[PDB]
Amino acid sequence: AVQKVVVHPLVLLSVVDHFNRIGKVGNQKRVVGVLLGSWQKKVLDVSNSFAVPFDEDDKDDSVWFLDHDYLENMYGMFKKVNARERIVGWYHTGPKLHKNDIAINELMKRYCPNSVLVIIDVKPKDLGLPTEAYISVEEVHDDGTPTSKTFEHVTSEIGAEEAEEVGVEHLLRDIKDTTVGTLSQRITNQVHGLKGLNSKLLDIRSYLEKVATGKLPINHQIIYQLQDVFNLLPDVSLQEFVKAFYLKTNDQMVVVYLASLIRSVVALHNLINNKIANRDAEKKEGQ
């Protein structure tokens, strides 16, 4: 159970560039490649990658040409180039997951006992990261149908040690927007988080509407989860929560008030100093 996975900027940009290749080459709408990283502890570090000639037909969905021979050739080839790199997963440039994915993941697991799939969204977004991490786990459907091979989500994020940081932030600085303004940045974080939550609930509402209209079958599990969420919603007008809220907000405002005093006093000191210095200077020019 690989709880945590960290992708790296190099693999991200490489996937982007390869997808751009394929876009120029033809119209495939999705692309696949292999992901190399050192599975340090139960936390994977997907730290390099390379594409694999892949294809499929829009209709059958059982047709594709993932080249395992090519795969092995260059897995060994990159092993030769560097040693601490033995396959850990595979990436695909699919805006959404596909059925093909389970079979492809089994194929890759043939090489990696615990392989990790990742979806990289070359198409942009504004809510979360451009990556998603999935693992082919099998769970028993407590009721009804037998167990099936289904993908499962794992905590995926992004990092770089120092060198990738230098390169990425350099290119950013070249073409970017304002850096961390502390207050500004973290308020922007608040608003961005609100936007993401809103988009997610838009999505869940849309699905619920589809089900209510009957465009898809009722999934008692998804229901269970939804009413769990609602059951988990809190109560604010509890008359204890509110008293505590006011009390601690009072403490927060007290500290902010004193800090404001600090700011005001220092600014006033600065004003006194500047005024007296300027007066003495102009007196000098007078004499």
Added chain:
Amino acid sequence: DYAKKRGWVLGPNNYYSFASQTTIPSTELAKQVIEYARQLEMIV
């Protein structure tokens, strides 16, 4: 008749009733703190 003078309620026993006797002000407090940040932040 003076019960014309709003007659209070006369309670149960003509007690003339009596002297008659939450909601986190979230939005307004948010406005206040946003304003604090704004003032802290302008170049001025």
Added chain:
Amino acid sequence: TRPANHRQLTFEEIAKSAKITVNEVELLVMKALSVGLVKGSIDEVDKRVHMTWVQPRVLDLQQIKGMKDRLEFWCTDVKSMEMLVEHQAHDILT
């Protein structure tokens, strides 16, 4: 059935529900909690059982629609409030 707002229950209420003397209503809820059908606590002075959570339950289409209504109200709240903050911080934003 009881909504989250006042999901508190009472011994006599259970008695009008599943037949059992108020003496053993506590035992019934006791077993319920232990098996884990629900979570919460009891207040035998008020004879009121607080219910924080119950097992997920099957739902019908009209219940789906009601949940959608609640979700819509929620999403409107979020959108309004995000817009409020964005507006009042517009000058301080990047």
